[PDB]
UniProtKB/Swiss-Prot annotation, chain A:
Reactions catalysed according to its record: a ubiquinone + NADH + 5 H(+)(in) = a ubiquinol + NAD(+) + 4 H(+)(out)
Originating organism: Sus scrofa (Pig)
Subunit structure: Core subunit of respiratory chain NADH dehydrogenase (Complex I) which is composed of 45 different subunits.
UniProt-recorded name of the protein: NADH-ubiquinone oxidoreductase chain 4L
Keyword match NAD: yes
EC number: 7.1.1.2
Keywords, comma-separated and alphabetical: Electron transport, Membrane, Mitochondrion, Mitochondrion inner membrane, NAD, Respiratory chain, Translocase, Transmembrane, Transmembrane helix, Transport, Ubiquinone
GO biological process assignments: ATP synthesis coupled electron transport
Swiss-Prot record, chain G:
EC number of this enzyme: 7.1.1.2
Protein name per UniProt: NADH-ubiquinone oxidoreductase chain 2
Oligomeric form and interacting partners: Core subunit of respiratory chain NADH dehydrogenase (Complex I) which is composed of 45 different subunits. Interacts with TMEM242.
InterPro entries attached to this UniProt entry: Complex_I_Subunit_2, NADH_DH_su2_C, NADH_UbQ_OxRdtase_chain2, ND/Mrp_TM
Species assigned in the record: Sus scrofa (Pig)
Known function: Core subunit of the mitochondrial membrane respiratory chain NADH dehydrogenase (Complex I) which catalyzes electron transfer from NADH through the respiratory chain, using ubiquinone as an electron acceptor. Essential for the catalytic activity and assembly of complex I.
Superkingdom, natural source: Eukaryota
Amino acid sequence: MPLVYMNIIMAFAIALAGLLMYRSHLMSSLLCLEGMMLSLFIMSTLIILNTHFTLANMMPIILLVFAACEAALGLSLLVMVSNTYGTDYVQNLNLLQC
Amino acid sequence: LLDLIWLETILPKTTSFIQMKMSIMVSNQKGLIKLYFLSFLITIMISMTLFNYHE
Amino acid sequence: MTMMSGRPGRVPLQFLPNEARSLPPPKLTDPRLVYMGFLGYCSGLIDNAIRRRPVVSAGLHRQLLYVTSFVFFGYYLLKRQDYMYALRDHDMFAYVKSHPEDFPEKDKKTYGEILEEFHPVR
Amino acid sequence: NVLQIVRDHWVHILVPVGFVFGCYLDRRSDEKLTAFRNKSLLFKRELRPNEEVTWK
Amino acid sequence: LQYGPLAFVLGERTTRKLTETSKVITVDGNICSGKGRLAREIAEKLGLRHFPEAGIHYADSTTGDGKPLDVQLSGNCSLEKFYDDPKSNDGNSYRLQSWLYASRLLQYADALEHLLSTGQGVVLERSIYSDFVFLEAMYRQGFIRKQCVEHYNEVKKVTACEYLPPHVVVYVDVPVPEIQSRIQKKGNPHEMKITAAYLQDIENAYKKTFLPEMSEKCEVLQYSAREAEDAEKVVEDIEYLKCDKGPWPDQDDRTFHRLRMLVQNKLEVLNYTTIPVYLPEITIGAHQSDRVFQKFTELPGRKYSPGYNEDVGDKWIWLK
Amino acid sequence: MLKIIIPTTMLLPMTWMSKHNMIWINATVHSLLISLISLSLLNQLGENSLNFSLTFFSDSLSAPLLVLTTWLLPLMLMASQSHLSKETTTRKKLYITMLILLQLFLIMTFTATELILFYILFEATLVPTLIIITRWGNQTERLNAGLYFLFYTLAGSLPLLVALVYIQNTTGSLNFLIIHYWSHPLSNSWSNIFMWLACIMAFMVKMPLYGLHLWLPKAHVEAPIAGSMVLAAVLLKLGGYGMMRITTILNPLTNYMAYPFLMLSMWGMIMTSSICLRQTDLKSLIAYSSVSHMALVIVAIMIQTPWSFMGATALMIAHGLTSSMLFCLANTNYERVHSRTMILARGLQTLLPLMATWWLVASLTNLALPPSINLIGELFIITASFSWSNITIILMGMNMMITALYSLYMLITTQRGKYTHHINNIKPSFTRENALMALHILPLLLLTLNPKMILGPLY
Amino acid sequence: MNPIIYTTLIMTVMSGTMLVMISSHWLLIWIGFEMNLLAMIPVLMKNFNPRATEAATKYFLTQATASMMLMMAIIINLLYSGQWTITKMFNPVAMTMMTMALAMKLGLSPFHFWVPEVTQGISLQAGLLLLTWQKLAPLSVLCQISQSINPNLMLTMAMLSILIGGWGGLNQTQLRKIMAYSSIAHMGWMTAVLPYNTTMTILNLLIYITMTLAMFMLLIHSSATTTLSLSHTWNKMPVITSLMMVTLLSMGGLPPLSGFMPKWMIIQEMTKNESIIMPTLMAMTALLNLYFYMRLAYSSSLTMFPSTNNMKMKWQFEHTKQMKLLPTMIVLSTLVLPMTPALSSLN
Amino acid sequence: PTIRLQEDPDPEDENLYEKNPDSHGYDKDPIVDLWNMRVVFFFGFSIVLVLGSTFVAYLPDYRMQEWARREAERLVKYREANGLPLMESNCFDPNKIQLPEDED
Amino acid sequence: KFYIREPPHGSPDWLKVGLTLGTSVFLWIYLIKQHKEDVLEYKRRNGLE
Ligand SMILES: CCCCCCCCCCCCCCCCCC(=O)OC[C@H](COP(=O)([O-])OCC(O)COP(=O)([O-])OC[C@@H](COC(=O)CCCCCCCCCCCCCCCCC)OC(=O)CCCCCCCCCCCCCCCCC)OC(=O)CCCCCCCCCCCCCCCCC
Ligand SMILES: CCCCCCCCCCCCCCCCC[C@@H](O)O[C@H](CO[C@H](O)CCCCCCCCCCCCCCC)COP(=O)(O)OCC[N+](C)(C)C
Ligand SMILES: CCCCCCCCCCCCCCCCC[C@@H](O)O[C@H](CO[C@H](O)CCCCCCCCCCCCCCC)COP(=O)(O)OCC[N+](C)(C)C
Ligand SMILES: CCCCCCCCCCCCCCCCC[C@@H](O)O[C@H](CO[C@H](O)CCCCCCCCCCCCCCC)COP(=O)(O)OCC[N+](C)(C)C
Ligand SMILES: Nc1ncnc2c1ncn2[C@@H]1O[C@H](COP(=O)(O)OP(=O)(O)O)[C@@H](O)[C@H]1O
């Protein structure tokens, strides 16, 4: 693979790692989710352009659509959590245990 | 000494003690997504190297 | 691992290939069908008991429908099961016939020529 | 008057009926294992002038 | 057809049946006051359905036949011995209070179901919102413990929050000495032992908790004793209320759908009355529970479901 | 053999359709008739077994066990109807249903021609027993007793399932006739050693082997009387039957894998007999008696001789009858005085003479007085052990002396002495209890009259 | 919530699952997962309260992470072989990531923390849906790629799931958490036999779904979510407690009940390979699930717990809503072992 | 209340002899109890015990003990007269056995 | 006797009863016919009769 492929894969890994380790704000983790979506878009677009697969040029648009759906879902859940606690801290979501 | 104590001690009482201790260890989590998402990260990293690096 | 998922000539959602019509259908007095009818009767009794109705006498039409439905499904279930087992045997025999080297019939030895160790019990 | 007697003691035929049904089913099961009837090296026998099978 | 999601999907809507006379009404008052007569007159004048005050055997009146059952199989508490021995060591007082709260909850569910099914108004004597005055009077007199009060508060918290409060609250005010005079004039030998402090506690609870907190949900119509016999004046006073302040105007079709699904299914209504809080006053041992349940199942119309008891003359069972 | 299976399945709806006041009568009469029918299975051959079908067969080892099961059902019915009088009709029918299901599973277990079917039935016998113990026991220890009974059994039985499916994948069949005819020796390897252990430990825990028996005193003391009867008389013999069946494929590995179990059996026989000498509970004494006798049976099965197999069969039948009788005898006193302590009610021979005679006969058969079949089995096993090694007579000899001691200790403590002064509610023995004791004891001596019917296939 | 909207959301959940099950393109499978999650999130919040909101948030975060890893594995597979068809998965790193993503979606151990929490935070109907219908899509995808699966990782996660399910279930008094740990252990059993025979996976899935449906419907019938609230059901409907006791016995795996059949067949299949140690450990561990099922049976059916006075009022009324499939579910959960050879029709 | 729960008192045990001085210990109903006694006695002692013991005593000899005795008598007679040994160490004719060729 | 309608009256719901019985009879006759044609087809294919 070229260097650009490794760079995009590294960006995906960094965004995943970012999502895995929570600080305080929920919104930061949502941003990491969007970052993973962007990295996947870039990687798929590069692969499809390189191989000249004409009918596959439309998949990244579908990916963006479902990324938007996912982001809207997350934002709605954040609105509800904030309305409950007045803060979007993940520390407050501790009513249910294992 | 034997029937009421040691035969009880080795087979059933040891089993009950071990199962209860492991149940306490496994089931007592605070329910904070931070901790077990960090656990998920550790699992993912271990999995690629331990089982993925060897194909 | 899927043994029969991709066998040539298999129709995706058929449940009963035309080849299965060459096999004898299960008899209507098949004990497996009778057990399915028993399952339906048990379902009817449990339905009576859960709804706080007289268990044995409450609804005879409902109990009849239960038994009939279980028997009706069981008949086709048994037909499909028998077809699958016939297919398995057919494939096994064809493969053994087409690979004679892997299934040799070696010489038979009588017990008067086979040396078996004797272990006394004492 | 036998109506009440029957409705009170009809549960007394279930077990004998089960016994005779079990006997019948055992005979039916025996009917499916005749592949070696009159064929063993120890009991092979020429048929009598009238009988058809050596055992049922 | 049984009301449910299918009935709501096509057709049935509650908001159309409300015809400016839905108006859940409750007529509160102290002991021996003539609140029942006023409630009956209000119901007759306004054309609403009258619900007499729920007693120990209210639930019996609505299931099977309307006839009451033995106190051992229903209630397991006595109003008379509460007056005779208010400090009995068998927990009769709080058991009676808890049973009466459950009966009031059932009656409120029945009234709400009738109103939401027909659009007709209902008049109640007391409510689940008023039942606490007797509990406070018992606790201040030392008739029940504090743990009983905590249990009552838990049950009320998980039950009374799911319904809509009455549109208008009518209160009949009668002074305590006049109440004692009326009780003496009555003749019942058990009510004579009611101390004046008990009635004073009921009155304090009413006037300092119930009316203040009820006035925020909707305006309260208070009446002295003399201005309660004139029923037509009270009714015409009710007809000129501006009811746009409580939760009732803020109810749309879906909330009414949820409430209508809740008011039927009386098992769902009574769910939280039997929570596993083990108070000695209301906890019944396994042996007695089994014996009483076996006794109950032997009643003439109780072993099976309503339409399936051939020992009270149910026919065609084997086709139902 | 559906002529026996189907009538029990008919006992089920006969019980559930009977009038509220005829369930005991109907169940008892038809159980006795089913026992009479099963009596025909004693006509066995000298060379092979009775092969009824592809699924069921009857040997000379399982026919007496089936007869014992079918005979034990009516006795349990008579023993149960006293203390279940205040129970509701539905729960009484459920109790009878549990007993009938247990009999059906036991009947099918002893005649299954395959080992996996035998496993499924021998494991299905758990559910009715556990339900009976944990639902109709008297004290709060019954829950723990049920847990002990369940898990001790399953922890032994699951490796047996693994070993059985492995054996079927290896040899192609689990049918017992094919297994016997196509037998091949076991080599000396760790895989074979663990296969032996997996095939043996479940039956060992069923006997139960000394050190693995702690579940038995709990389960047999905390159970109701019918539960104790069927636990001591039939359910312990599942281990012996299964072990004699499975040992066909374990040779020649057994020749040395039997040593730890043999030492455990002999020494723990001595230990359990000694434990019987200091026991305050009358039922626990009978339970530990069962453990000692079953240790003898384990030794007999492990040394693998014709005489030891004959002795094992005879001892299993005799012990079933004797231990069931002893449990019923103890339950009579428990129902009178509502206590299991042995020294509470004393001098009972003065108050109940005929019951004292029943006690004497039961305790005489417990100590193996000749020519009872108890002694026939014990003596055959002792002779086989002596041929195995001349030093076993010392351990065997000690056991005989100890068994007599604790049996007569039980008899003298319960029947002789002076009656306790404060107990005045000791009513005369009912006809039902006397009939129960007679139906226990008369078949024992009748079998003594013709002992080849309980000596197994090696006869 | 409007009944029409609820029905539309349920059909969208099922449409996402069916799109996963009928697609041949990896993109369509990923789309099916996205649609399923999008429709599932509001169903968990149908009865709005802070616990339901927390459960929905945790579920969304876990499943969104899982789908992100799923898409990355698909893209890596495309990079090393320009194939979109769901097949043997030509790349090993992509297969490892795919396995981890599907395990996260199913709730297999190590990623099993979310299941007890989401199950306890939602209603019994939402729990029924979550623990029955939501297992179909990841299991179907795993079945379609079973050949390229690495046994060492899948078997490790399956054994960990069985162990953790038993140990976690040992400690619970809440019924929903008990159900969740039971689900974890059964998922472990399902995935243990997947590399050897997918028919056994399907059979175990069907039997587990039947037993779970029966248990959840019995719990909804008698409105109990705690052990102590279930201890009252004997004084109101004893038949329900008896049927629940028998179903709990079936869940434990005791013969001659139907629950025993999947474990038996999986053990046989694993011994048809070499694989001797793993089934032995799996059975020994399932003994723990049997233990806490037996404790529940002790508390609800085999002993009678004390009751309250107000149960007398409940005695007078009947259950309004009736579940039409509950008797058939109970019968299928209990008395189906003699029909075992009918599993041949599954392949 | 200084109590913990509402419970029935533990009742005294009933004596079946009080209402029925000849009670047989089977049931509280005298008629049902008498018939339970009768069926138990008739079907246990009269039917199963005595008739079953007679049936077992007169079972036909399927174990072939007498057949084996007569066969052994014939064999002993034949072998004694001919001068042949009473019994042979080998139960299988060595002509039908083929030992391995080499023992070294 | 009952305080309220208890909608299932003394006569059974005749529409539901008729539908249930008709479904049962239809299924039974369909099964009989299907088994007969299956037997005929099996006998024809293998040439028994
Ligand atoms: C293996 C070989 C074959 C065996 C097959 C398997 C076993 C049998 C089939 C199982 C299913 C069938 C029945 C299902 C419905 C039962 C539900 C029920 O409640 O029953 C009550 C019901 C009584 O109710 P009722 O009469 O309306 O009035 C009384 C009140 O209802 C009073 O009722 P109540 O509610 O007020 O009373 C409360 C009571 C009520 O609680 C119960 O009744 C418990 C019933 C639970 C049903 C079982 C669960 C599902 C099935 C799984 C079975 C697994 C078997 C495998 C082994 C494991 C053992 C568990 O609860 C308790 O008292 C708690 C006691 C705690 C004990 C815990 C043990 C429970 C589990 C035991 C299950 C054993 C198997 C079934 C036993 C028989 C049940 C009738 O019983 C019956 O009357 C029906 C039974 C008889 C029907 C069959 C008769 C057929 C017709 C006769 C002719 C025969 C034809 C022969 C042909 C030849 C020509 C002559
Ligand atoms: C409380 C009651 C419980 C029930 C009792 C169950 C009884 C189980 C006992 C098992 C009997 C024997 C098992 C193995 C057979 C031989 C044992 C071994 O010690 O013998 C020597 C084995 O040598 C050494 O001892 C090696 C084994 C050492 C490791 C074993 C651990 C033992 C420690 C005790 C742990 C307790 C076990 C029971 C747990 C409760 C023989 O030498 P070798 O010829 O080379 O091995 C023979 C096998 N070959 C032919 C394939 C080679
Ligand atoms: C606990 C008991 C389990 C019960 C489970 C539910 C039972 C009732 C459900 C009724 C099933 C209806 C389906 C039949 C209608 C036609 C559909 C048919 O075309 O489907 C075929 C499939 O047939 C079905 O699978 C048969 C369903 C029968 C299931 C019952 C077997 C249960 C095991 C034994 C337990 C005893 C059951 C007793 C029932 C009362 C298509 O085959 P195919 O598309 O190529 O396979 C896809 C999967 N592959 C390729 C990966 C293999
Ligand atoms: C209360 C007062 C008591 C004392 C008074 C009693 C008066 C005297 C009566 C006592 C009788 C004395 C016994 C002496 C023995 C005589 C009987 C003997 O000769 O019969 C034996 C026969 O006995 C029977 O074979 C044994 C009875 C079978 C026992 C089975 C019990 C029935 C089933 C009950 C339930 C099973 C539970 C146990 C499960 C295994 C001989 O056997 P056999 O050598 O051949 O006969 C040769 C000739 N044949 C073959 C042609 C017949
Ligand atoms: N919730 C309650 N708690 C205790 N006692 C009550 C309760 N409700 C009614 N009572 C008693 O019922 C009796 C009469 O009730 P009330 O409605 O006030 O009089 P009236 O019959 O004239 O309407 C009084 O003795 C009153 O104390």
